Design a protein around this ligand. Structure first.
Ligand SMILES: *[C@@H]1O[C@H](CO)[C@@H](O[C@@H]2O[C@H](CO)[C@@H](O[C@@H]3O[C@H](CO)[C@@H](O)[C@H](O[C@H]4O[C@H](CO)[C@@H](O)[C@H](O)[C@@H]4O)[C@@H]3O)[C@H](O)[C@H]2NC(C)=O)[C@H](O)[C@H]1NC(C)=O
Ligand SMILES: *[C@@H]1O[C@H](CO)[C@@H](O[C@@H]2O[C@H](CO)[C@@H](O[C@@H]3O[C@H](CO)[C@@H](O)[C@H](O[C@H]4O[C@H](CO)[C@@H](O)[C@H](O)[C@@H]4O)[C@@H]3O)[C@H](O)[C@H]2NC(C)=O)[C@H](O)[C@H]1NC(C)=O
Ligand SMILES: *[C@@H]1O[C@H](CO)[C@@H](O[C@@H]2O[C@H](CO)[C@@H](O[C@@H]3O[C@H](CO)[C@@H](O)[C@H](O)[C@@H]3O)[C@H](O)[C@H]2NC(C)=O)[C@H](O)[C@H]1NC(C)=O
Ligand SMILES: *[C@@H]1O[C@H](CO)[C@@H](O[C@@H]2O[C@H](CO)[C@@H](O[C@@H]3O[C@H](CO)[C@@H](O)[C@H](O)[C@@H]3O)[C@H](O)[C@H]2NC(C)=O)[C@H](O)[C@H]1NC(C)=O
Ligand SMILES: *[C@@H]1O[C@H](CO)[C@@H](O[C@@H]2O[C@H](CO)[C@@H](O)[C@H](O)[C@H]2NC(C)=O)[C@H](O)[C@H]1NC(C)=O
Ligand SMILES: *[C@@H]1O[C@H](CO)[C@@H](O[C@@H]2O[C@H](CO)[C@@H](O)[C@H](O)[C@H]2NC(C)=O)[C@H](O)[C@H]1NC(C)=O
Ligand SMILES: *[C@@H]1O[C@H](CO)[C@@H](O[C@@H]2O[C@H](CO)[C@@H](O)[C@H](O)[C@H]2NC(C)=O)[C@H](O)[C@H]1NC(C)=O
Ligand SMILES: *[C@@H]1O[C@H](CO)[C@@H](O[C@@H]2O[C@H](CO)[C@@H](O)[C@H](O)[C@H]2NC(C)=O)[C@H](O)[C@H]1NC(C)=O
Ligand SMILES: *[C@@H]1O[C@H](CO)[C@@H](O[C@@H]2O[C@H](CO)[C@@H](O)[C@H](O)[C@H]2NC(C)=O)[C@H](O)[C@H]1NC(C)=O
Ligand SMILES: *[C@@H]1O[C@H](CO)[C@@H](O[C@@H]2O[C@H](CO)[C@@H](O)[C@H](O)[C@H]2NC(C)=O)[C@H](O)[C@H]1NC(C)=O
Ligand SMILES: O=C(O)CC[C@H](NP(=O)(O)OCCNC(=O)c1ccccc1)C(=O)O
Ligand SMILES: O=C(O)CC[C@H](NP(=O)(O)OCCNC(=O)c1ccccc1)C(=O)O
Ligand SMILES: *[C@@H]1O[C@H](CO)[C@@H](O)[C@H](O)[C@H]1NC(C)=O
Ligand SMILES: *[C@@H]1O[C@H](CO)[C@@H](O)[C@H](O)[C@H]1NC(C)=O
Ligand SMILES: *[C@@H]1O[C@H](CO)[C@@H](O)[C@H](O)[C@H]1NC(C)=O
Ligand SMILES: *[C@@H]1O[C@H](CO)[C@@H](O)[C@H](O)[C@H]1NC(C)=O
Ligand SMILES: [Ca+2]
Ligand SMILES: [Ca+2]
Ligand SMILES: [Cl-]
Ligand SMILES: [Cl-]
Ligand SMILES: [Zn+2]
Ligand SMILES: [Zn+2]
Ligand SMILES: [Zn+2]
Ligand SMILES: [Zn+2]
Lengths: 687, 687
């Protein structure tokens, strides 16, 4: 038979291993010839595997690269202008790769050019609360200073935005061993830790879902009109550069000024973690100087788009997508995910060659330029937004399959919770000590739900990956799954190789296979189940949780709620109505031979995520349109619930016009209550 | 049998007459008790007639009324401050209505309060080109002047916007007999002309599709957060008041200053039509003083929403809607349309009582507060936008059925052209001299298409009526039809009564019946045809016409097109692609027992109008989202094609930064080409 088990059994760990090796021998940086050749290879193989059509979709988008003949670096400069210490020009390459060409040196993509010279201030993780502590509590002024911040906790673009708004004239990012060196594990190549010369690449944009900085709203096709660079979206205004902890130590060790305020500001280096500004007495006339000469350049990128046409509902799309571009070899990010997609395509294709087709159309995507701001997925979604709007059932992401070997991690819309619980109960756990047990059992034991006994944790989607446009802009039900730790030290470094994965993460490729089963099984059910496998009642449960949560934040300010008559009554009423209507819809869904009633009901299911979209967007973030979830304004990686109300309440005690600020809280309560009620009403009887 | 002919034959002229009489005995001003009682009556009758459900949908929106104890008027004031002439406080009521209560005196709805005193400038119709002529050619400065303008040619809100931007401190609107008194016809009550004491009421907002001024984007429900009045949408900044031509004569007769520039500035009164500013020598120290004391007031309004559930596709909606509120008796506007809707509901209900149901759901609407800015339709569409987005097949408007007795007038999306041609070929002409001939024959003879031999004229939709939110905001295929002249003199005056219609417009009610057949027949076909009755190829034809037209406007500036490399190549390419893809889709539609392929194809048809929506809206007009059509920025009543490019090109030779201005033309070309190609691609094979 051709059923989910046939699909799942055809997936092989050895194939995933072979593909991973194949995808990680040379760098595949977005916009480079190497990455275009890999696109062509994947296109050819997906055709061979049996897809109906496989095309490249190309766009010309703003990318950023160092200047090969004018390298980026940082100095300590003495009184006379002599550079007495320089940061590294490259990471020492790993064994056997010391002759590999085209390894991009560490840099922060989209940094402007400059050579700012000044006194250092250490800003911990450069989070919003770190700058509050500096400016409000310690009375330390970052204006015209170079800020040094440790990576971790939040997306690096938010750090740079925060430093810019504090008045910094440059930002140095570094990896502290506190955050990137696990106790008792050896550095690469003898373990999975970050050596002192390792450095994390990565973009520092604040795009808020715009896609290519030059063409917000529209695909960057051949005739696109482009904004000028001065009007581009999300570019930083000050130079930024990342360094490793050997180099950071040399920059921090001389720091003077104020002591760190408490232990949460101290990393693991043998330095005092003084905040500054500037260096201690003997070195007070020394300064730090950045030299950044990277350039932004409109460059062609290529997505591979494969189609497996549905037998019954070809105009309903289930999308499995993940990126292909990498900073260097992409041993984990993204090729551990891409190899899994490749094996999934191969397995679906095996069934297709035997005469099977899924009920709905499956689209498979190899996205380009994810690392430069989700550019490939976002431009393609901008190009196809009307098709996706009206036909998109679900999007399953497929970036890195493993970031650890401890347990599963799933982030998804509440509409997929039941699907994920049911699927994982039917899959075998790959975990030691759980042989013969289900993946649901091992996952639930290792990652318990905070609210429910005998249930696993499932997180909210934020951003920082290619589902963003589908979920937060377009309102298509989205999910992701990968293996995780109890992100990882070698992230975006030259050391993230095939050998890292094969030796230290997943020698048997069993965690990769488990992830392929989860992602592939979700796609299979979404594309083949007669009734779409979404449970609207799970959204009702979470909406009440989120409403309780946002009300509790507001209730920290009882006097103001009294003064400005701030009531959450409408939001709770809408949530209550959603719960009631969803229950009734579930009864009809269970109780309804009529394909029109079925499809009518499948359309109600498909458009339910869509109903949470507000076509006016969130305040000053027009491409974040989902009213229940948005990426946190303080950390793109984290999801925030009722974001419009959350941001209206955030730090509200500091606003100079409380009447206006509380007015805006009330406005956001009304928008949220209305959107919840409107979404509920899409589940009512249609006439 | 239950077919379209059964539906059409059940419609009766005598019923339409009885309903019109019933709806026009007392005023039904929006927000008044009288109009709530009429809503309740219609609700009850639609239930009796056989609809499945009939509900009131109420909202609390900003309305505007004169102050009953502090009347609005205008004076000529002499040097000493004595008011030597005053305009009328009311229109002399028509025979037999001189004791009717609650006739709102003439006023301009949403005028602010004030008592500005100053010198008059006469501005013709206060169109954009009239102000260009004044300021650029005649060097006449309106700043701090009271402007007097004749009604006609463009929506009165645009006149007020233009006067405000010219610096006027007040606007007086009047009806010139040149525009409102047909030669050889008697004034009311002995003919259909406007007497010298008649006055046109009407709102002067510039809402650009926002709906209630206080709640743009969201329905004005019980918990709505409202903007403060200073942030409200579309309110005028200067006092405005309308007067009749006896009073206008007294204001114009003393005008001095410059002569009218040419004959197109002269009306039919026995005055020189001097532009001013101010009065001739002997009266130079006299001024004009306005006294406006109207108030804006949040007020409850009520739409009646009736549902006839579809037998096969209950989740597809065909909507027949028209307003119920009137300025006074609403003899033509809107009750000539409302009486027709009422008879249409009655006829559909007769079929339903015999066991028939339409294939798709039909929704019937009696909208409130249309006269105050399309408020009732727009708030309801804001409330139900997700249902309408995903389920709305078509909207047929049903305001005034007759504005003349000469011929039919149809304005609609190209998607309905074929439907309208086919339907009118099957209806009898009511016209004298065409007995036994089709309505298509009489209409085509009287109103020939400018481009095609043996075809009738069909115009573009703009705004100024309740289809606006459905078509220009939401992208639901929309149409309207009414009888017209070869708008009308008594428009918005107390004289627009039942007797006006019965005596002078349509004594036999045959034109009303013809309009009921056209509107009802369109609804019947849209709700019952197996394949939706839309021909995408008709959109291809018009898109080429519009592209030729916009290119021709640009080509008035060859040097600039050379300098800034302004090419329309992408737009023509997209139009060519649309034409090709539409042709292929039509072949499949004709060539495809499979209800999924059918519904898949019906969905492609339904979402084709939807594909012309840009979720970012047009520049500075976020609620006008259709890229092919928008209401003209100079005249809300008129439709403009490729509005984004049109407005970018308009008066471009006057812009101080030609590089920036031509850059924006190129941007709008890209948006238009992309949207046309994207809409075309919705008609491609789906996978
Ligand atoms: C959740 O679903 C419930 C339906 O089960 C829905 O209930 C609706 O609530 C509204 C707002 O409370 C009700 O609105 C009232 O409607 C009546 C007419 O039916 C009006 O007369 C009321 O207005 C008077 O009272 C107001 C409040 O004191 C005054 O401000 C006002 O000036 C009037 O005096 C009022 O508008 C509505 O009838 C019910 N609908 C039902 C029961 O069917 C509720 O709104 C949903 N929640 C959300 C967030 O949408
Ligand atoms: C109307 O439909 C047609 C399809 O029938 C569609 O044609 C497409 O046009 C685009 C733009 O002209 C073509 O794009 C080219 O694609 C190739 C790869 O296939 C590229 O190599 C080309 O880029 C090179 O040349 C450019 C122009 O000189 C340079 O600027 C560039 O740097 C490169 O050197 C180019 O991107 C596309 O292939 C066709 N697609 C087809 C034929 O299938 C057309 O776009 C549609 N009209 C609209 C408005 O969408
Ligand atoms: C995840 O798995 C669960 C457990 O199988 C699924 O729930 C079960 O769904 C079935 C089919 O809808 C329900 O069966 C129905 O039972 C009622 C009797 O009350 C009957 O009227 C229907 O004809 C049908 O037999 C069953 O009750 C339900 N079990 C539960 C909720 O415990 C669930 O749907 C799966 N989730 C997915 C597919 O997203
Ligand atoms: C308006 O009326 C016209 C005239 O009847 C409709 O056009 C006609 O539509 C029919 C049905 O689709 C076409 O018949 C088809 O003919 C082809 C043979 O080429 C065959 O393959 C199909 O099986 C079917 O018989 C007919 O050709 C066509 N006539 C024309 C275009 O002159 C039109 O569809 C109506 N418009 C509406 C309903 O919106
Ligand atoms: C990755 O695998 C691909 C597919 O097997 C390899 O590309 C093939 O290489 C052979 C030998 O050079 C050619 O004859 C084929 O035409 C290629 N097939 C394609 C591109 O579809 C590629 O060599 C492998 N890369 C690495 C580093 O092992
Ligand atoms: C990258 O840096 C190089 C090396 O400094 C730049 O090349 C120089 O450009 C200037 C003109 O601005 C020439 O006069 C020099 O002769 C060049 N030097 C060398 C060694 O080639 C180059 O412009 C930079 N590339 C960019 C900014 O894209
Ligand atoms: C850090 O790097 C800089 C740049 O290469 C070095 O400074 C240069 O030294 C050369 C050779 O002595 C001079 O001719 C250049 O003018 C210097 N350039 C600048 C910008 O100062 C510097 O010596 C290096 N410092 C260390 C400690 O290695
Ligand atoms: C308009 O017609 C309606 C419906 O026939 C009339 O309202 C009815 O009036 C009678 C007698 O007063 C009542 O017994 C009914 O209850 C009413 N029916 C309703 C409201 O549905 C109304 O009188 C007519 N108005 C005019 C001016 O003729
Ligand atoms: C309408 O105009 C009346 C009449 O001038 C206003 O009523 C007066 O309001 C003032 C307070 O502002 C009182 O002191 C007077 O006694 C009132 N006069 C009379 C004759 O009643 C009224 O405010 C206006 N209504 C509005 C603005 O809604
Ligand atoms: C126009 O109307 C005004 C307001 O009613 C009249 O002026 C008033 O006249 C009365 C009685 O003589 C005075 O007590 C008021 O003080 C006046 N009010 C104002 C605002 O001036 C005026 O007489 C009328 N003019 C004509 C020609 O009828
Ligand atoms: O520009 C962007 O938005 C992201 C680009 C790029 N994405 P990528 O490195 O491939 O993946 C980020 C890894 N982390 C996650 O996906 C994540 C998200 C939420 C919670 C925990 C982890 C980056 O973070 O630099
Ligand atoms: O606020 C609005 O947009 C319009 C309100 C109100 N609409 P209403 O008087 O009922 O109908 C306007 C009549 N003219 C049209 O509909 C029309 C539209 C396009 C071309 C020719 C005529 C008005 O024009 O004052
Ligand atoms: C920080 O420093 C600059 C002076 O160089 C000043 O303009 C700015 O206002 C300072 N901010 C605070 C909070 O002291
Ligand atoms: C794999 O799991 C083992 C056992 O818990 C652990 O020692 C090792 O650190 C894990 N590898 C990685 C990369 O986390
Ligand atoms: C119109 O009049 C005022 C002077 O009262 C002046 O400020 C304004 O600039 C004038 N405009 C022109 C074009 O002369
Ligand atoms: C009705 O038609 C007749 C004949 O052409 C004409 O004399 C009359 O003016 C028309 N009535 C109206 C209101 O247009
Ligand atoms: Ca873009
Ligand atoms: Ca509103
Ligand atoms: Cl992922
Ligand atoms: Cl109409
Ligand atoms: Zn990644
Ligand atoms: Zn990455
Ligand atoms: Zn009207
Ligand atoms: Zn009107």
């Amino acid at each position: 038979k051709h059923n989910m088990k046939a699909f799942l059994d055809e997936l092989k760990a050895e194939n995933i291993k072979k593909f991973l090796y194949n995808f990680t021998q040379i760098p595949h940086l977005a916009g480079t010839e190497q990455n275009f050749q890999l696109a062509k290879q994947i296109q050819s193989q997906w055709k061979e595997f049996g897809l109906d059509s496989v095309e490249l979709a190309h766009y010309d988008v703003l990318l950023s690269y160092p200047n090969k003949t004018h390298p980026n670096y940082i100095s300590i400069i003495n009184e006379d202008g002599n550079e007495i210490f320089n940061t590294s020009l490259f990471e020492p390459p790993p064994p056997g790769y010391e002759n590999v060409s085209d390894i991009v040196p560490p840099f922060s993509a989209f940094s402007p050019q400059g050579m700012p010279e000044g006194d250092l201030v250490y800003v911990n993780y450069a989070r919003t609360e770190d700058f509050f502590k500096l400016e409000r509590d310690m009375k330390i002024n970052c204006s015209g200073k170079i800020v040094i911040a440790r990576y971790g906790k939040v997306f690096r673009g938010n750090k740079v935005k925060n430093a810019q708004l504090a008045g910094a004239k440059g930002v140095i990012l570094y990896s502290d061993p506190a955050d990137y060196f696990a106790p008792g594990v050896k550095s690469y190549p003898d373990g999975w830790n970050l050596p002192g010369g390792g450095v994390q690449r990565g973009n520092i944009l604040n795009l808020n879902g715009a896609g290519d900085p030059l063409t917000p709203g529209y695909p960057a096709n051949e005739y696109a009109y482009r904004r000028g660079i001065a009007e581009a979206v999300g570019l930083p205004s000050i130079p930024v550069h990342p360094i490793g902890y050997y180099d950071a130590q040399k920059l921090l060790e001389k720091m003077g000024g104020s002591a760190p305020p408490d232990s949460s500001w101290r990393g693991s280096l043998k330095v005092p973690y003084n905040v500054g500004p500037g260096f201690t007495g003997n070195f007070s006339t020394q300064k730090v100087k950045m030299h950044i000469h990277s350039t932004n350049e409109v460059t062609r990128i290529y997505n591979v788009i494969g189609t497996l046409r549905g037998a019954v509902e070809p105009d309903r799309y289930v999308i499995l997508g993940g990126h292909r571009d990498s900073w260097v070899f992409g041993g984990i990010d993204p090729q551990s995910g891409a190899a899994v997609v490749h094996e999934i395509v191969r397995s679906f294709g095996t069934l297709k060659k035997e005469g099977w087709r899924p009920r709905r159309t499956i689209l498979f995507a190899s996205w380009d330029a994810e690392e430069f701001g989700l550019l490939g997925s976002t431009e393609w979604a901008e190009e196809n937004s009307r098709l996706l709007q009206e036909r998109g059932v679900a999007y399953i992401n497929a970036d890195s399959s493993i970031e650890g070997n401890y347990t599963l991690r799933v982030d998804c819309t509440p509409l997929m919770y039941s699907l994920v619980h049911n699927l994982t109960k039917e899959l075998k756990s790959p975990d030691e000590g759980f042989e013969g047990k289900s993946l649901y059992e091992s996952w639930t034991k290792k990652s318990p739900s905070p609210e429910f006994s005998g249930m696993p944790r499932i997180s909210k989607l934020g951003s920082g990956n290619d589902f963003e446009v589908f979920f937060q802009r377009l309102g298509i039900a989205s999910g992701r799954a990968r293996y995780t730790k109890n992100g990882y030290p070698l992230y975006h470094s030259v050391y993230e190789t095939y050998e890292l994965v094969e030796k230290f993460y997943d020698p048997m490729f069993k965690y990769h296979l488990t992830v392929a089963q989860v992602r592939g099984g979700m796609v299979f059910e979404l594309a083949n189940s007669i009734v779409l496998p979404f449970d609207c009642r799970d959204y009702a449960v979470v909406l009440r949780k989120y409403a309780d949560k946002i009300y509790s934040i507001s209730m920290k300010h009882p006097q103001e709620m009294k003064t400005y008559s701030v009531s959450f009554d409408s939001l709770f009423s809408a949530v209550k109505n959603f719960t009631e209507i969803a229950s009734k819809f579930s009864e009809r869904l269970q109780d309804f031979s009529n394909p029109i009633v079925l499809r009518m009901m499948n359309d109600q299911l498909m458009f339910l995520e869509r109903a949470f979209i507000d076509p006016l967007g969130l305040p000053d973030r027009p491409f974040y349109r989902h009213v229940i979830y948005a990426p946190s304004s303080h950390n793109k990686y984290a999801g925030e619930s009722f974001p419009g109300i959350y941001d209206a309440l955030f730090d509200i005690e500091s606003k100079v016009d409380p009447s206006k600020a509380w007015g805006e809280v009330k406005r956001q309560i009304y928008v949220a209550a209305f959107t919840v009620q409107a979404a509920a009403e899409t589940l009512s009887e249609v006439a």
